[PDB]
């Protein structure tokens, strides 16, 4: 390994190319010593044609290579890449790469590979443009893989000049009845720490999908949130429920409707998880004056069924706050506010009615009947 | 119906050239028959229809006849010259109609005018382009038309 590393100081100029051939001879003959060979070939003096040859002679045996060595391998591929050898290597690269195959040390170097690919594609627009032009030219096959998704999210997360072009390509791809559940399930179940890296870009893309028409687009804007919430840690869960509460308090009805359905989905899904952030679901009651009775029936239903998950009756806190704000809104003179109360009251009565619970609904329906007489 | 016509190629048979030239002349006589109704039926909505669909039909003639005409000219010249001089007689009535939407300073009419005039002058100079492609650009004559009312007067 050291001799290899020292060969550039040793050899005279007549005997570069010679050594070149017989090093490619050693390359096929032993894998372990891929790295220093490569480093050597790139610190030799050679003819570029030969370097194309050996680079293909990398690429063919790239399934056989232990992962640890891949980064500097693929760094080499993407410094040996020309402007003209772009799609060639990238299509081949994009095919041969697996990232299903590799999987505790595996996951760490996968992450470090992605760091290295980030730095590559971050660092030459040459790749980004052509990379995309190579994923759009895979709109043909329904079968384009986890890498193509994760890679898109990545170029949107890093590369800025392209943001419209990624969104354009993703929208013309997603409408077409390409990327669907099955892809996202596998992506977010396997590559979840690579994606917890890029938390921003995920939720940035989910928000940009909620603002379009076409239930297919907005369905994906939903699902992107869904999988981030299901899978990611408590930090990113809080940030997820954050963007949805931003839509409810803030947006126009489409956004509001969407986000309400999503919270409704996530709570029947995992009551316990939303329980942590259920304070931010109550934080919508600030701006009840910006939201319509339809949406109010659904909101009081979602909060009320969160509370009437049976195991979370230790955390009656939200339930008692809502009971409180009910009697408060009922006890307003103004018909607009009494109406909000009445809706919430009857929804809550209904969900908790599915002997003390009988007395509870009795009291609530009697007091709404009495305020409303 | 006329916009669903495809222009052919020079490689395509003379039979299909003549059947499409026949189908074009059927549409150009149906168009002159429809235009000739204007004089006896002068009203707001009927003028709005013909100013509008005049130029919209002129455009079907610009896209799906004029490519068939550069192919089938050295073979079927007389057919095509007849088809074009048939359109010229109602061409002149659309120029006179443009006269009427000007003199009756009528805004509802004068909307589709600037495009009518431009779309018509496109078809004039597209004929010059046809003669250029058939190597006789020296044969394109042009000359002005007498400003009539719809019926045929000399409004002066």
């Amino acid at each position: 390994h050291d001799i290899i590393t020292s060969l550039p100081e040793i050899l005279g100029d007549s005997q570069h190319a010679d050594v070149g051939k017989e090093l490619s001879d050693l390359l096929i003959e032993n894998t372990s010593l891929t790295v220093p060979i490569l480093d050597v070939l790139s610190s030799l003096r050679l003819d570029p044609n030969f370097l194309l040859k050996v680079r293909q002679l990398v690429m063919d045996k790239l399934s056989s290579i232990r992962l640890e060595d891949l980064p500097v391998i693929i760094k080499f591929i993407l410094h040996s890449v020309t402007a003209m050898d772009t799609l060639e290597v990238i299509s081949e690269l994009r095919e041969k790469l697996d990232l299903q195959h590799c999987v505790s040390s595996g996951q760490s170097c996968i992450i470090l590979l992605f760091d290295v690919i980030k730095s590559a594609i971050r660092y030459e627009k040459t790749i980004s443009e052509a990379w995309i032009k190579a994923i759009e030219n895979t709109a043909s096959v329904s079968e384009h893989k986890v890498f193509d998704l994760v890679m898109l999210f990545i170029i949107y997360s890093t590369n800025t000049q392209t943001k419209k072009y990624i969104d354009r390509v993703l929208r013309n791809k997603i409408r077409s009845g390409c990327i669907q559940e099955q892809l996202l399930q596998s992506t977010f179940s396997v590559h979840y720490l690579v994606l917890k890296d890029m938390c921003s870009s995920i939720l940035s893309l989910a928000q940009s999908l909620l603002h379009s028409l076409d239930q297919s687009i907005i369905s994906f804007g939903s699902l992107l949130y869904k999988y981030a919430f299901k899978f990611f840690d408590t930090y990113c869960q809080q940030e997820v429920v954050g963007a949805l509460v931003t839509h409810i308090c803030s947006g126009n009805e489409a956004e509001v409707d969407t986000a309400l359905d999503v919270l409704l989905e996530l709570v029947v899904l995992n009551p316990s998880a939303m329980m942590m952030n259920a304070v931010f679901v109550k934080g919508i009651l600030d701006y009840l004056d910006n939201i319509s009775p339809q949406q109010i029936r659904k909101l009081f239903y979602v909060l009320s069924t969160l509370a009437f998950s049976k195991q979370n009756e230790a955390s009656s806190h939200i339930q008692d706050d809502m009971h409180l704000v009910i009697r408060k809104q009922l006890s307003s003179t103004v018909f607009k506010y009494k109406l909000i109360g009445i809706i919430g009251a009857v929804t809550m009565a209904g969900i908790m009615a599915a002997d003390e619970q009988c007395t509870q609904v009795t009291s609530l329906l009697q007091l709404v009947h009495s305020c409303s007489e | 119906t006329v916009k669903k016509i495809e222009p052919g190629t020079a490689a395509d048979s003379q039979q299909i050239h003549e059947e499409k030239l026949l189908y074009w002349n059927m549409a150009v006589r149906d168009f002159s028959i429809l235009i000739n109704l204007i004089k006896v039926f002068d009203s707001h909505p009927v003028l709005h229809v013909c100013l509008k669909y005049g130029r919209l039909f002129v455009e079907a003639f610009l896209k799906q006849c004029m490519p068939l005409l550069d192919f089938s000219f050295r073979k079927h010249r007389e057919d095509v010259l007849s088809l074009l001089e048939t359109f010229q007689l109602d061409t002149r009535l659309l120029h006179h109609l443009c006269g009427h939407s000007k003199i009756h300073q009528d805004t509802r009419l004068t909307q589709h005018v600037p495009l009518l005039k431009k779309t018509l002058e496109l078809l004039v100079c597209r004929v010059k382009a046809m003669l250029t492609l058939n190597n006789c650009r020296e044969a394109f004559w042009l000359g002005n038309l007498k400003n009539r009312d719809l019926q045929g007067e000399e409004i002066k």
Binding site: - | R77, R92, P114, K118, C125, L133, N134, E138, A139
Partner: protein
């Protein structure tokens, strides 16, 4: 410094040499003009000089009609039959393109606000002086490359800018009542001097017709097809928006302007010789 005495006696000297001497070296003639223009632009707007040049062109190259006697050597001596044709034609036109862009951003900004009265007056003086320019080139018998086609395309822009001026006076006159005598005079002058000479010149070039890769040949002629249609379109929308002004300011400016000159084609008996 543009207003320095030494700048002004420099501009004066340049003008004098351009006005006296001939010099049949081409780019030399071009250059003492380019100088003179770049000197003049910083001192005052350049329409007086453009009208003088269009009048020398009218004198030198003749006319469409084949029977008008004109000769106006006296204005600028570095303008020849040899010079002026692909030379001082281009120069005078390019200086108008700019002058018209100056005036059109002015109008654009005036329409923003809703100070005004001196703004419209100077706009109109410019437009009227360079109309004496456009009229004197439109009379002339001009060579038929982009020399004529640049004039055509700039006469499109002439009318566009007037269409916009019109649409601004629509915003004013509906509220108050005006179209001051300078604007009525302008629309009359566009009818009497320019619009019918458009139709005389369009027909003069169109009729005027004096080895070719098929695609490039079609691209050449389908480039040449657009500018005459869009001159018709531009004048039609001028006249059209003069209708809207006529109705909603209670003065028919359609009294000054004529009914639209309309065209029918022919094909002659030469097709039978060639095919």
């Amino acid at each position: 410094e543009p207003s320095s005495p030494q700048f002004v006696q420099m501009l004066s000297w340049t003008s004098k040499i351009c006005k006296e001497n001939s010099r049949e070296d081409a780019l030399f003639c071009k250059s003492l003009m380019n100088l003179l223009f770049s000197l003049h632009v910083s001192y005052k707007s350049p329409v007086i000089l453009l009208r003088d040049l269009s009048q020398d062109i009218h004198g030198h190259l003749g006319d469409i009609d084949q029977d008008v006697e004109v000769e106006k050597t006296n204005h600028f001596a570095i303008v020849n039959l040899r010079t002026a044709a692909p030379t001082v034609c281009l120069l005078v036109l390019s200086q108008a393109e700019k002058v018209l862009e100056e005036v059109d951003w002015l109008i654009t900004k005036l329409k923003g606000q809703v100070p005004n009265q001196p703004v419209e007056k100077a706009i109109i003086m410019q437009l009227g002086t360079l109309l004496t320019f456009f009229h004197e080139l439109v009379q002339t018998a001009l060579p038929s490359g982009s020399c004529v086609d640049t004039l055509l395309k700039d006469l499109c822009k002439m009318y566009t800018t007037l269409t916009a001026l019109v649409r601004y006076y629509l915003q004013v006159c509906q509220s108050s009542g005006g179209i001051p005598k300078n604007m009525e005079k302008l629309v009359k002058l566009s009818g009497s001097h320019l619009t019918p000479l458009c139709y005389s010149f369009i027909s003069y070039v169109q009729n005027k017709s004096k080895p070719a890769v098929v695609a490039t040949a079609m691209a050449r002629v389908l480039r040449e097809t657009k500018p005459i249609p869009n001159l018709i379109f531009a004048i039609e929308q001028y006249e059209k928006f003069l209708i809207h002004l006529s109705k909603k300011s209670k003065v028919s400016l359609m009294q000054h302007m004529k009914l639209s000159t309309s065209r029918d084609f022919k094909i002659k008996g030469n097709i039978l010789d060639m095919v």
